[PDB]
């Protein structure tokens, strides 16, 4: 019943005889399945998750230099040194400055200088290696029970592709899903930047000129290639300057245009995955196929409304007393349109039922219940121009 209202919806019907029915599930797409004397079911891919992801390398895209420290020596007094030169969180550089009387030296000449600053990462992106088989999918199966828009969650993986799922009152449904997504995780790296994510070529990833931490480094601070975001300036032999090179965030986004983008709605992998499944409905059964026909009268609780796919939704309440019972439903004298919410049943007189049916093109008659007060509603499904 979940599909009712979703524009990206498919109505897949099982080939007259054959138990199997092939469907394609993707994010923001719903699928309605029908088969002769079988319940109508609604499928939706709710989440895709990359499990057991091995971090290959982590890159710095925005950095900050702090704790700047300098040491100089007087001319001929050798090379200066700071302890920081041995601290791997620090970026250092040796240069020469003009020394003399006015800057604290007995002699006039080129005195060695050394400038150290603490390289701190403000923003990073991590590249993850994901094993195709480790991609978990979450499918929700909702039966067409007439009850408000109840659903059995089911998890599959390209390995555990085939699962039997039991639906309370309808029996079991066998699902055989394919390891055939539009995703070659082989030689691809899942590049994650905050809330954005993409799938990119391994060699391109490793060849990026940015400071990095290896996959192995357990939340380290010893960024390799710090030089790629740091610059030392000493043009007049008066002073050495250390300067940060500015956020590569937007630059990265631009580099990543001709890449497979992955979206992250509510901080999860909710894109580029599509699952081609096969469905066996031989163990499925219509709920209340044993119940008797409704005798009483029906009321129209909400005005009949048309869905985006030409189908119509009728919310009705039972006034009679036979419940639990089968609702008599039909769409002059000869049958015309088809039912989507197959074998509509009443559970309680108080609880209304939602019946989805496909009316025929043009004028039709929606007849709900049996006499007296048997509802004889009118529909108009006009034809469409190019």
């Amino acid at each position, epitope marked *: 019943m979940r599909c009712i209202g979703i524009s990206n919806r498919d109505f897949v019907e099982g080939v007259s005889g054959g138990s199997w029915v092939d469907i394609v599930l993707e994010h923001g797409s719903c699928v309605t399945t029908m088969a002769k004397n079988k319940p109508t079911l609604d499928f939706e891919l709710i989440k895709t998750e990359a499990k057991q992801p091995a971090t290959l390398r982590k890159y710095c895209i925005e950095a900050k230099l702090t704790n700047t420290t300098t040491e100089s020596r007087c001319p001929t007094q050798g090379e200066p040194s700071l302890n920081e030169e041995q601290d791997k969180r620090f970026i250092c550089k040796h240069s020469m400055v003009d020394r003399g009387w006015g800057n604290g030296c007995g002699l006039f000449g080129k005195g060695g200088i050394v400038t150290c600053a603490k390289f701190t990462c403000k923003k990073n992106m991590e590249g993850k290696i994901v094993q195709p088989e480790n991609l978990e999918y979450t499918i929700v199966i909702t039966p067409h029970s007439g009850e408000e828009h109840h659903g059995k969650e089911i998890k599959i993986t390209p390995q555990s592709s085939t699962t039997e799922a039991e639906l309370t009152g309808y029996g079991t449904v066998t699902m055989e899903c394919s390891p055939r997504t539009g995703l070659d995780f082989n030689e691809m790296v899942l590049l994650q930047m905050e809330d954005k994510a993409w799938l990119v070529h391994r060699q391109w990833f490793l060849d990026l000129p940015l400071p990095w931490l290896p996959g192995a480094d357990t939340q380290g601070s010893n960024w390799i290639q710090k030089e790629t975001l740091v610059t030392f300036k000493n043009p007049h032999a008066k002073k050495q300057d250390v300067v940060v090179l500015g956020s590569q965030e937007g630059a990265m986004h631009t580099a990543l245009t001709g890449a497979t983008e992955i979206q992250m709605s*509510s901080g999860n992998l909710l894109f580029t995955g599509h699952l081609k499944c096969r469905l066996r409905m031989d163990k499925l059964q219509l709920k209340g196929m044993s119940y008797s026909m409704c005798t009483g009268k029906f009321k129209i*609780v*909400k005005e009949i409304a048309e869905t985006q796919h030409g189908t119509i939704v009728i919310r009705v309440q039972y006034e009679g007393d036979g419940s639990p019972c089968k609702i008599p439903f039909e769409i002059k004298r000869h049958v015309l349109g088809r039912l989507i919410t197959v074998n509509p049943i009443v559970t309680e007189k*108080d609880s*209304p039922v939602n019946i989805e049916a496909e009316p025929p093109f043009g004028d039709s008659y929606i007849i709900v219940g049996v006499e007296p007060g048997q509802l004889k509603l009118n529909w108009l499904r006009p034809l469409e121009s190019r």
Partner: antibody
Amino acid sequence: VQLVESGGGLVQPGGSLRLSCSASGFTFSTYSMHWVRQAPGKGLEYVSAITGEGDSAFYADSVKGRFTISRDNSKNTLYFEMNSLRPEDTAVYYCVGGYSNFYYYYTMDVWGQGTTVTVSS
Amino acid sequence: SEIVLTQSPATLSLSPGERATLSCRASQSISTFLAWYQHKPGQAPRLLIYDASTRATGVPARFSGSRSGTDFTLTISTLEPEDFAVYYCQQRYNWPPYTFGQGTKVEIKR
């Protein structure tokens, strides 16, 4: 399933205040959260709302400009950082929440106990 | 345009055991998106009915809701002493504001 509000108190006119609403017993991110107030002897006034994800916010003209709704899904807390307080904002402020699948829309809700805000000199 | 909900009567004086009928009028069609609340002083407002006719979880059956275009009705069949409160209607049509009615007070007739 509950909502606990706090931060109510006496404030001087032109003054400012921040209200909190701590959510428990549910996935806070799945609920559109709302602020409803009731001035003494007056009815319920729907004042503001925020999406489950914090993305988008709504404010009734009566508060639009001075009041800012916000939320922390890590800390399961809704806030009504209310600045530029006037005597007419004196009321019991309730937070309400409902499972939302589309922006601010909801069916069944959850209400907190209320917090009194007094704006007086 | 702005949706206004109009509640009538302002005060409803009845005896326990009687049938109470409360009306709420929308300024334009709000379809079926109407909710009813029970408000007791020194208590948080309580949701009774949503979608004009659906009883909330645990709400007793004496509470009934019905629609007729822009005119909505809250019915309480056998009034019990704890049903003596203030009743509000609320619109949940489309987009906010999800505004309220001015309220109806259900008082004991003596």
